[PDB]
Design a protein around this ligand. Structure first.
Ligand SMILES: [Mn+2]
Lengths: 77, 173
């Protein structure tokens, strides 16, 4: 069944595109500066930076899942 | 207690930084991120569906079925991505109001200048009412700045409360 290997290639492409888009916006999402010098501005900017980072981690885990799945298609064929 | 800080500090602090441009760039970025992940979701459903049929087999289905949790997770991630941009815009709008509503430093300084000038010439008690007038205006600037800053804290805090933790994906067995 060649079709399973085909799928595995597609799933790997999907992984490549997720991490690509993620890495593409990381420099903006993780670089959020506080609008002003007050505590509210700073806390908001900090939260957003941490939120962007936990998202980057979440996608990396999804990339792992995608790759494990594509591997289940190849070695499982 | 931004009401602990005096108007000179609260006003200066809100006029200090670089403005919201950094937050707005991040907003656009989260949006393009929601878009890509929409397209990713659809191409993953494509790989599972449209590009499957040709080949049938019990193993093909066992995998196609074990992937269900993840496709559902993907949908939930997409919903959560579409909210970030919105909450960022609320943060920024609130900041804009704080910045716009703070008492300008010049008005605080002109108030202290004039009060001191009256004091200088009040050996005869002629200006005691007007000094009381300038003192109340100053205290009012202190309360106003404090209130602006309280309302900014409240709005930003609400916005942030809508940003729910990123949940981990399940495995594809
Ligand atoms: Mn208020």
């Amino acid at each position: 069944p060649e079709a399973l290997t085909v799928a595995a290639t597609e799933v790997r492409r999907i992984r490549d595109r997720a991490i690509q888009s993620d890495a593409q916006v990381a420099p903006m999402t993780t670089a959020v500066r506080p609008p002003a010098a007050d505590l509210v501005s700073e806390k908001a900017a900090t939260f957003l930076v941490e939120y962007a980072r936990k998202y980057r981690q979440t996608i990396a885990a999804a990339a792992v899942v995608l790759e494990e799945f594509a591997h289940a298609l190849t070695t499982g064929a | 207690a931004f009401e602990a800080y005096p108007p000179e500090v609260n006003s200066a602090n809100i006029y200090a930084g670089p403005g919201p441009d950094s937050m707005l760039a991040a907003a656009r970025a989260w949006r393009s991120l929601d878009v890509e992940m929409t397209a990713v979701q659809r191409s993953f459903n494509r790989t599972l569906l449209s590009l499957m049929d040709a080949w049938a087999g019990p193993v093909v289905m066992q995998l196609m079925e074990a992937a269900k949790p993840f496709v559902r997770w993907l949908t939930d991630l997409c919903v959560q991505l579409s909210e970030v941009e919105r909450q960022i815009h609320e943060i920024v709008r609130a900041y804009e109001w704080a910045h716009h509503d703070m008492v300008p430093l010049a008005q605080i300084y002109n108030n202290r200048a004039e009060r001191q000038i009256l004091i200088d010439n009040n050996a005869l008690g002629q200006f005691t009412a007007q000094i009381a007038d300038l003192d109340q205006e100053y205290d009012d600037f202190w309360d106003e700045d404090g209130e602006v800053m309280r309302d900014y804290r409240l709005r930003v805090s609400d916005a942030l409360s809508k940003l729910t933790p990123w949940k981990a994906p399940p495995p594809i067995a």
